[PDB]
Amino acid sequence: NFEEPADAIEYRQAAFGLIAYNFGDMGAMLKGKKPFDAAVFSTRADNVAALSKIPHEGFIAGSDKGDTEALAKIWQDKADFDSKMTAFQDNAAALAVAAKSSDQNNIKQAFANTGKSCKGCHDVYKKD
């Protein structure tokens, strides 16, 4: 569905920028930068879970050139990339469900598990 590689890059960059903004607001609440607000937290969690479904489609073959932070390694080891992306989606979904209840510890763990997805993929597949 992408006419040019720049379109696939823009698609996936846009999605991750939206992810990072919404995920960072949950982090701010859990880290104590701002008070925990259950209603906003749940919107943020719902948003990350839905947005997690988006960027994978942009990682098309032949889109490592130009203005992207994606490494060529993605396409050398695509099944591992895909495994990490799936695990991220599943972790984000689990965070959304945790955010529908009051148990704070369950939220904290789900957030942490999701965060470990970001870092695990970042470390292998994104430019420093």
How far is it, in rounded angstroms, from Cα 19 to Cα 83?
A: 19
Counted residue by residue, the chain has a size of 128
* Contact between 104 and 74 (Cβ < 8 Å): no
Contact mark string toward a copy of itself, 40..59, x via CB under 8 A: ---x--xx--xx-xx-----
118 annotated to a ligand binding site = yes
Binding test (CB under 6 A) with ligand HEC, winner from 45, 49, 85, 110: 85
How far is it, in rounded angstroms, from Cα 96 to Cα 43?
A: 9
Tell me how crowded residue 56 is: count the other CB atoms within 10 A of its CB.
15
* Contact between 114 and 99 (Cβ < 8 Å): no
Task: Provide the β-strand partners of residue 126.
Answer: 70
Between 25 and 125, name the residue whose CB sits nearer to a copy of itself.
Answer: 25
Measured torsion, CA atoms of residues 66, 70, 73, 76, in degrees rounded to the nearest 10:
-80
Choices 28-36, 38-46, 77-85, 96-104; region in contact with ligand HEC by CB under 6 A: 77-85
Binding test (CB under 6 A) with ligand HEC, winner from 5, 9, 96, 110: 9
Q: Shortest distance, CB of residue 54 to ligand HEC, whole angstroms?
A: 11
Q: Is 114 in the site for ligand HEC (CB under 6 A)?
A: yes
What is the contact surface with a copy of itself in residues (CB under 8 A)? Answer: 1, 10-11, 14-15, 17-18, 21, 24-25, 43, 46-47, 50-51, 53-54
